[PDB]
Structure 1
Amino acid sequence: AVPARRTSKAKKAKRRTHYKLTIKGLNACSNCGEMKKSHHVCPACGHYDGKDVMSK
């Protein structure tokens, strides 16, 4: 159909309380202590389970 009215400034914001970006698990490494993702290959470290994996 066609919207009947202008929605006010209040119901702009009362929708958008579920329009967020959130960040999931951030572990710290072993070889550098740097904040990186759980279960993921540590990119700057190049290690995972203490192994030169991304090498080659």
Structure 2
Amino acid sequence: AVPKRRTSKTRKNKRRTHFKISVPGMTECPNCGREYKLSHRVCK
């Protein structure tokens, strides 16, 4: 089984509308000026 006709620019783009890393959960870090993942450790 192989594609019978080629995907259009536009088809392939509608296909990828869900294909994206989303913004990480992040929070105001140790009062050390850092920035860290939610629920993950401050680091020195």
Question: Shared topology, TM-score over 0.5?
Answer: yes
| Identical-residue share of aligned pairs (%) | 50
Q: TM-score, structure 1 length as denominator?
A: 0.61
In the alignment, what sits opposite 1:41? 41
- Provide the rounded CA distance (Å) in 2 between the counterparts of 1:39 and 1:27: 9
Which structure 1 residue ranges, 4+ long, deviate > 6 Å from structure 2?
none
Structure number with the bigger relative contact order (C-alpha 8 A, sep ≥ 6) is 2
- Provide the rounded CA distance (Å) in 2 between the counterparts of 1:27 and 1:19: 25
Which structure has more helix as a fraction of its residues?
A: 2
Report the aligned-residue RMSD: 1.5
In the alignment, what sits opposite 1:7? 7
Give deviations 1:17-49, integer Å, cap 9, x for gaps: 111011231111242143211211112xx2xxx
Q: Does the Cα contact within 8 Å between 2:30 and 2:42 map onto a contact in 1?
A: no
| Structure 2: segments with no counterpart, 5+ residues | none
Count of residues in correspondence between the two structures: 44
